[PDB]
Amino acid sequence: PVAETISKRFWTLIKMLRFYVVLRRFGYIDPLIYSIDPKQIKDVLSEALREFVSYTSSSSSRSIVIYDDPKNPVTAQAPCLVVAKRDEIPQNFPSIYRYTIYKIDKSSEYCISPLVVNDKYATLITPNESVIKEFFDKLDSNIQYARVLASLAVGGE
């Protein structure tokens, strides 16, 4: 069950790669789909993980809308890895990647960040060593893990 177990165990990687999809940094996605070389895929992921620390280290906090009601919008403090102007993000993306793009309260700008909502609170999700280790190992035994990971990341929320 390469897909269901990937969605359970490597959920934090899926969420990271989706963050990059939203930013259209497809250099970190394309090799997982088209490359037949595990070494090349591991290289790209190492670069992806490193650039991700630049984001997680530089982040600012904003009050974001985690549940959008016309009357009682639920807002939460969340770390925003990127704060984007509305016209810097594709028009269709906010409704596709709904748990990666968030409205910043009392503002037109977007919070772009791999967050998970537990309706009240928002939590930054980052891949831990275990997940990276495991995925790299699975990847060496079967390249399909790259294909399915990218497929899920590109998918909406």
Side-chain angles (χ1 to χ4, degrees):
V2 180
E4 189 65 54
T5 73
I6 283 151
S7 87
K8 280 160 183 173
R9 310 195 65 76
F10 309 130
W11 157 65
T12 57
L13 283 173
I14 294 169
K15 212 79 175 60
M16 186 191 70
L17 289 176
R18 173 145 52 238
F19 165 77
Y20 284 126
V21 171
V22 175
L23 299 173
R24 288 173 289 165
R25 291 189 57 71
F26 296 122
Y28 299 136
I29 305 298
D30 292 343
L32 281 67
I33 291 161
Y34 300 105
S35 185
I36 69 192
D37 187 357
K39 289 175 137 95
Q40 172 61 22
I41 294 166
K42 283 192 272 158
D43 268 32
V44 167
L45 284 174
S46 72
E47 295 177 6
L49 287 165
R50 170 62 186 86
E51 189 178 316
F52 196 63
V53 188
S54 303
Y55 288 112
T56 62
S57 70
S58 297
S59 130
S60 61
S61 260
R62 300 301 229 99
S63 191
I64 58 161
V65 178
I66 60 171
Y67 184 83
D68 198 16
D69 200 335
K71 304 310 199 191
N72 277 40
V74 184
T75 63
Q77 193 73 337
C80 295
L81 297 191
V82 178
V83 174
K85 291 210 219 198
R86 194 149 286 201
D87 64 349
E88 293 168 1
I89 295 307
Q91 290 189 336
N92 299 324
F93 270 24
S95 65
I96 293 163
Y97 304 108
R98 296 180 308 166
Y99 289 121
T100 309
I101 302 168
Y102 296 84
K103 285 155 86 168
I104 300 176
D105 192 43
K106 318 255 178 167
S107 161
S108 70
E109 294 179 349
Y110 284 126
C111 178
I112 298 173
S113 201
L115 304 169
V116 163
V117 173
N118 286 290
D119 263 54
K120 184 148 184 179
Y121 306 133
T123 305
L124 184 62
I125 286 310
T126 69
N128 76 327
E129 184 190 331
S130 293
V131 168
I132 297 161
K133 171 181 76 175
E134 278 169 20
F135 183 76
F136 278 18
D137 287 332
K138 297 288 190 189
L139 179 63
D140 284 301
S141 70
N142 183 12
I143 296 143
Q144 285 292 297
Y145 278 91
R147 307 283 183 265
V148 180
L149 185 66
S151 298
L152 296 171
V154 152
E157 300 169 302

